[PDB]
Amino acid sequence: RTVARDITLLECVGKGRYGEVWRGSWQGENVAVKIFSSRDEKSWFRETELYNTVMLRHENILGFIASDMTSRHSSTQLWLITHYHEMGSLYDYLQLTTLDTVSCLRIVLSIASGLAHLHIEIFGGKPAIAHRDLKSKNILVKKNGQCCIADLGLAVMHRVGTKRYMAPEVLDETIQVDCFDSYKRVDIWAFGLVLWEVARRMVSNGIVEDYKPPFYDVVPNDPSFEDMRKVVCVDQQRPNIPNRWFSDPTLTSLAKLMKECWYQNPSARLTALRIKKTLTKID
Ligand SMILES: COc1cc(-c2cncc(-c3ccc(C4CCN(C)CC4)cc3)c2C)cc(OC)c1OC
Ligand SMILES: COc1cc(-c2cncc(-c3ccc(C4CCN(C)CC4)cc3)c2C)cc(OC)c1OC
Ligand SMILES: COc1cc(-c2cncc(-c3ccc(C4CCN(C)CC4)cc3)c2C)cc(OC)c1OC
């Protein structure tokens, strides 16, 4: 039988230190192709090792298609091929769009759903998985208004995370590194920051906040580890809740939820399953 492997690379939709992401075509269908820099080969290996362990399949997890290693004269080429989401990342989307109540809730509940699927062990099934780099650039927007979580290159099963989104116990190095629940609680902190980024873009009473990343007002671009530690650990700052949120029942409820993702004590934070339940009772 014929095995048609050729993928046509059509346009670059992302370039970074990690490498590049391309819109590609396979048998008439869009795929996304991540081409890894040699500097970040371990991210390809870890994501491949995870998918070789458990073939994750969930509407709110970026859909795996293939992992390819190709021999070159002087190098190894590493590609990850996934489903293609033409609307791009949540980070991108929130810059050019405001949200109504239904669309805000649908976004955040879909992220909570993907995250709970990663976190929870299924027996007989899947190991529990922590993401370790959850942020709005690692979430894609689907045409049906739900999102999916991308990039399992740091994931752990039961490179460091983006500093802006690191929990206090990562910044002060008190994290219990031998305890898998520690890693879930780091993801919950980051989830709360994403919930804040999204909630800002939800209109109420004709008001909306401009898109800003978490801590935009207290750290520089590309904040250092020390910049983040001083804000999050020493001063114990948290993102601002605008007064206008307290005129809107949805944003009032979301503010409470994000507060319960940001406790200094990791074991006080809500679980992904509890976040899902709370979001199903909002509106
Ligand atoms: C090697 O490389 C790539 C391969 C493919 C690809 C292309 N056609 C057909 C296939 C195929 C799938 C599954 C079976 C099964 C059939 C049932 N039987 C009991 C076991 C075997 C056979 C063939 C594949 C996997 C795509 C690629 O890119 C999208 C590849 O490159 C990464
Ligand atoms: C990698 O990705 C894609 C792969 C394919 C594809 C191509 N040839 C053959 C297959 C296949 C056939 C049959 C089985 C068997 C398995 C056991 N038992 C005997 C019942 C069923 C498995 C696999 C597939 C899945 C199509 C895709 O898209 C249309 C892919 O997505 C981009
Ligand atoms: C975060 O991580 C990964 C993401 C993806 C991925 C999947 N679908 C779509 C995208 C995308 C498409 C298009 C735009 C822009 C460009 C055109 N226009 C001006 C606005 C829209 C942005 C983003 C990406 C980047 C794939 C990955 O691996 C293959 C990723 O790594 C795991």
Swiss-Prot record:
Record topological domains on the Cytoplasmic side: 1-283
Disulphide bond pairs: none
Subcellular compartments: Membrane
Enzyme kind, highest EC tier: transferase
Catalytic activity: L-threonyl-[receptor-protein] + ATP = O-phospho-L-threonyl-[receptor-protein] + ADP + H(+); L-seryl-[receptor-protein] + ATP = O-phospho-L-seryl-[receptor-protein] + ADP + H(+)
Phenotype upon changing R1I: In FOP; with some atypical features
GO cellular component: activin receptor complex; apical part of cell; BMP receptor complex; plasma membrane
Binding residues annotated for ATP, in chain numbering: V13, G14, K15, G16, R17, Y18, G19, E20, V21, K34
Annotated catalytic residues: D133
Domain of life: Eukaryota
Family membership: Belongs to the protein kinase superfamily. TKL Ser/Thr protein kinase family. TGFB receptor subfamily.
Subunit structure: Interacts with FKBP1A. Interacts with FCHO1. Interacts with CLU. Interacts with type II receptors AMHR2 and ACVR2A. Interacts with BMP7. Interacts with GDF2/BMP9. Interacts with BMP6 (when glycosylated); the interaction may induce HAMP expression. Interacts with TSC22D1/TSC-22.
Protein name according to UniProt: Activin receptor type-1
Originating species: Homo sapiens
Whole-protein coverage range: 202 to 499 of 509
